[model samples]
Target: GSMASQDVIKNLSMNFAKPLEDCKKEMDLPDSVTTDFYNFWKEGYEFTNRQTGCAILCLSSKLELLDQELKLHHGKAQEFAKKHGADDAMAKQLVDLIHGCAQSTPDVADDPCMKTLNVAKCFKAKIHELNWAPS
Candidate 1:
């Protein structure tokens, strides 16, 4: 069950890597941020830049994971997980994890990019704690 989720996450990362390249220039992201994005699923890799979070928001948008208000689209996110081999339970769980992360992450009103990055770190840590992180 855990492996299934891991596989899905890995696949999602791989699938998005290409499209994310466009953001490198669009968001004026640095090369280091792009490198972190590509290795995001790799165990022990650390994300070091705030722009990486902005890139994540771009990727999430590409996947339609965000809504009109730029909030997590729970239904669509669950559908994405299910489409990528997650069971209904796992899909819902994943959505809850992200939603909770967004809620608990402090708002960086001056920089939405930083806000996303903070939420991402929180979400990543939670996934690792649950033993659900991709290897």
Candidate 2:
């Protein structure tokens, strides 16, 4: 275990914060717009396809490391969002959602459900538990 998974999780947490403010407001935002910044998400992997309109966005390499893997993932996700109808901002938001969701996924080593399998909390939870260990 060279901590590959742990490092990946750490970088993601550091790079993302709450999808920033959502290009805040898009001029064509419709009446049904949800109370959010980007109109970023439509379905699980879709974006720019919001009920209203979306925004223009890009990954700031200064803050976000667009390494090969992430670059690859980002490209597909961005295109998917755009192909599905997302703008730059909308596309970026989808990427943020993926980052945030990846971090949020639970890990449950303590779960009774663990009796079944892979039912533990995720890396963040793992860190939280261990840093407080000897309990």
Candidate 3:
């Protein structure tokens, strides 16, 4: 097999570093919010009903590349929840609960769980809310 080109490796490293740098800027964020953000991304991609598993997997892989710490936190949160019997249903419910709380209050955005939930809700509501008619 031919050796990988230096240019190819350099491009790949730069692509990977861009997201990490962005996430690091947001690293001062609370764990609760970051953890929730990770879950929301995971669930959004995983259970979107629009994309196939491969699409979701690709999205998740991209997210991991972009935010390594958030990705790690997401895995840890899932593991902890699972250890306490948080099944898919329960996990979804928990996410929803955090989401609901986030929707009612804008300040929650500073918190990880709330920030994640609210951000997700905002995106969903933007598309689904009745007042948002197609132009």
Candidate 4:
């Protein structure tokens, strides 16, 4: 069972800005602070286990272009964090987190992608069903 659905991806992308908008409005944060938080969250998602697993499967199936797509995005994420406010140590940690997730996939270990897929589906469903205030 694939963890990712067209709907889930669409929903996640559509709602991506909502959380940042809410944080900005509710927290009344300075522009820099809001930008930092948004950047962090964006970077966080790039390295997420679900995303990496999906990328690995996509690459293996040749459904997408290449595995480097994931790495490239994550690298940009790391760059963004460094440019924003994170120190080298923190940026390394952020990059590592994404790498960790990507590396953990069974595809690298010769295991099946099903387990990761199912888990990701559950996670996406939870996120979608949650009642979050936009602001």
Model 1 alpha-carbon drift over 4 Å, by segment = 42-45, 108-110
- Scored by lDDT, the top model is 1
For candidate 2, write residues 1-135 as lDDT tens digits. Answer: 225433433344334323333423424444343332222221222222233222112232233434533232566656555554446774675466545544454434432222111111232233443331111
| Model 4 Cα shift for residue 127 (angstroms) | 17
Best of the two (2, 3) by TM-score: 2
Note each model's CA RMSD in angstroms: 2.1, 15.7, 18.7, 15.6
Clashing pairs in 1: none
Give a tens-digit lDDT track for model 1, residues 16-81: 565676777677778888787767756677788877878888888877778776777789888887
TM-score of each: 0.84, 0.27, 0.24, 0.31
| Top-scoring candidate (TM-score) | 1
Error of 2 at 66 (Å): 17
Q: Rank the candidates by lDDT, best first.
A: 1, 4, 3, 2
Clashing residue pairs in candidate 4 (N, C-alpha, C atoms within 3 angstroms)? 47-98
Sorting all predicted structures by TM-score, with the top scorer first, yields 1, 4, 2, 3
Local error of candidate 4 at 29, Å? 29
User: Residue 24 deviation, candidate 3, in Å?
Assistant: 26
Q: Model 4 off-target regions past 4 Å?
A: 1-70, 107-135
Q: What's the lDDT for residue 94 in model 2?
A: 47
Q: Is candidate 2 or candidate 4 better by TM-score?
A: 4
